[PDB]
Amino acid sequence: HSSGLVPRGSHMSGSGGIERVFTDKARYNPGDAVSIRVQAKNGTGSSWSGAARLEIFHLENSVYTSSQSLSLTNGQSTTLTFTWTAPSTDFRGYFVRIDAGTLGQGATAIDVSSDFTKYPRYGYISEFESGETALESKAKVDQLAQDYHINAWQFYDWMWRHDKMIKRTGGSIDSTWLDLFNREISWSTLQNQIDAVHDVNGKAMAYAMIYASRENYSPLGISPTWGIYEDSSHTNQFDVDFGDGSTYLYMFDPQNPNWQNYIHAEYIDSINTAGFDGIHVDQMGQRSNVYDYNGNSIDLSTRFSPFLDQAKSVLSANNPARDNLTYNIVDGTVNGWAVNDVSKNADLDFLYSEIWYLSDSYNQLKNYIEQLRANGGNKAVVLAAYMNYADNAGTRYEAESASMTNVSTNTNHAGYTGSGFVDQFASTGDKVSFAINAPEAGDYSLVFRYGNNTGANSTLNLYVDGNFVQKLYFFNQSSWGTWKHDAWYQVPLTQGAHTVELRYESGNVGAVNLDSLTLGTFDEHSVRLADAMMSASGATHIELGDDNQMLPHEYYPNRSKTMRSSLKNAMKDHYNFITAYENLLFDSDVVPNDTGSQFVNLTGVSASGDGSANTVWYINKRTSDYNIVHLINLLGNDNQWRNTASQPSFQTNLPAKIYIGADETISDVYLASPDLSGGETQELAFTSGTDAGGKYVSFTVPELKYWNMIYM
Ligand SMILES: [Ca+2]
Ligand SMILES: [Ca+2]
Ligand code: NA
Ligand code: NA
Residue 538 CA to residue 559 CA, distance in Å, equals 28
The Cα 643–Cα 193 span in angstroms is 33
Residues paired with residue 659 on neighbouring β-strands, in sequence order: 696
**Using CA atoms, how far apart are residues 185 and 182, in angstroms rounded to an integer?**
9
Rounded CA-CA distance 356/284 in Å is 12
Q: Which of 63, 205, 183, 88 is nearest to 131 (CA)?
A: 183
Taking the CA of 235 as reference, the closest ligand is 1
Query: Nearest to residue 348, comparing CAs of 586, 113, 116, 117?
Result: 117
Contact 651, 635 (CB under 8 A): yes
How far apart are the C-alpha atoms of 471 and 251, rounded to whole Å? 34
Residue 323 CA to ligand 4 center (angstroms) comes to 6
Q: Strand 324-330 relative to strand 351-354: parallel, antiparallel, unpaired?
A: parallel
CA 282 to ligand 1 center in whole angstroms: 20
Smallest-distance ligand from the CA of 423: 2
Helix (H/G/I), strand (E/B), else coil: 218: helix
Task: Using the mean position of ligand 3's atoms as its centre, give its distance from the Cα of residue 156 in Å.
Answer: 27
Cα–Cα distance for residue pair 227/291, rounded to 1 Å: 9
Contacts by 506-510, CB closer than 8 A, 24 or more apart? 506/428, 507/471, 508/428, 508/458, 508/459, 508/460, 508/461, 508/471, 509/456, 509/457, 509/458, 509/459, 510/426, 510/452, 510/454, 510/456, 510/457, 510/458, 510/459, 510/474
Q: What CATH number is given for 588-712 in this structure?
A: 2.60.40.1180
- Reported as half-sphere exposure (CB side, CA atoms, 13 A), residue 332 has a value of 27
Distance (angstroms) between ligand 4 centre and the Cα of 456 equals: 51
**Cα–Cα distance, 381 to 539 (Å, whole number):** 5
The rounded distance, in Å, linking the Cα atoms of 339 and 137 is 36
Q: Report how far ligand 4's centroid is from the alpha carbon of 347 (Å).
A: 11
> How many other CB atoms are found less than 10 A from the CB of residue 325?
22
Q: Which residues of 242-280 are buried (b: 16+ CB within 10 A; e: fewer)?
A: eeeeeebbbbbbbbbeebbebbbebbbbbbeebbbbbbb
What's the 207 CA to ligand 4 centre distance in angstroms?
A: 19
Sheet containing 212-214: give its strands across: 212-214, 248-251, 239-241
Q: Hey, where are the domains in the chain? A: 1-115, 116-392+523-587, 393-522, 588-712
One CATH from 3.60.20.10, 3.10.350.10, 3.20.20.80, 3.40.50.300 for 116-392+523-587: 3.20.20.80
Strands 278-282 and 203-209: parallel
Distance between Cα 22 and ligand 3 center (Å): 5
Residue 181 is classified by DSSP as T
Relative to the alpha carbon of 315, which ligand is closest?
4
* CA distances in angstroms from 127 to 124, 152, 184, 284, listed in the order given: 10, 16, 9, 22
Q: Domain 393-522: which topology?
A: Jelly Rolls (2.60.120)
Instruction: Determine the CATH number of domain 1-115.
Output: 2.60.40.10
Helix 134-148 with 565-580: angle, nearest 10 deg: 60
Distance 181 CA to ligand 3 centre (A): 37
Distance from residue 700's CA to the centre of ligand 3 (Å): 29
User: Under DSSP, is residue 314 helix (H, G, I), strand (E, B) or coil?
Assistant: helix
Calpha distance 26→32 (Å, rounded): 13
Q: Are 259 and 305 in contact (CB under 8 A)?
A: no
Cβ atoms 192, 137 nearer than 8 A = yes
Nearest-ligand number for the alpha carbon of 323: 4
Distance 301 CA to ligand 1 centre (A): 20
Give the contacts of 166 (CB within 8 A, at least 6 positions apart).
159, 160, 173, 269, 270, 273, 274
**Fold match flag (1-115 vs 393-522):** no
Count of residues making up the chain? 712
Distance separating alpha carbons of residues 678 and 55, to the nearest angstrom: 14
Render the burial of 549-567: b for 16+ CB within 10 Å, e for the rest. bbbbeeebebbbbbbbeeb
Q: Report CA(349)–ligand 4 centroid distance (Å).
A: 9
Instruction: Say what the alpha-carbon torsion angle 440, 569, 516, 546 is, to the nearest 10 degrees.
Output: 100
Collapse the DSSP code of 585 into the 3-class scheme (helix H, G, I; strand E, B; otherwise coil) and give the result: helix
Whole-number Å distance, alpha carbon 418 to ligand 2 midpoint, is 21
Please tell me the distance between residue 40's alpha carbon and the centre of ligand 3 in angstroms: 12
Rg over alpha carbons for the chain, rounded to the nearest Å, is 27
- Asked whether 563 and 551 are in contact (CB, 8 A), the reply is no
Tell me which H or E stretch contains 707: strand 707-711
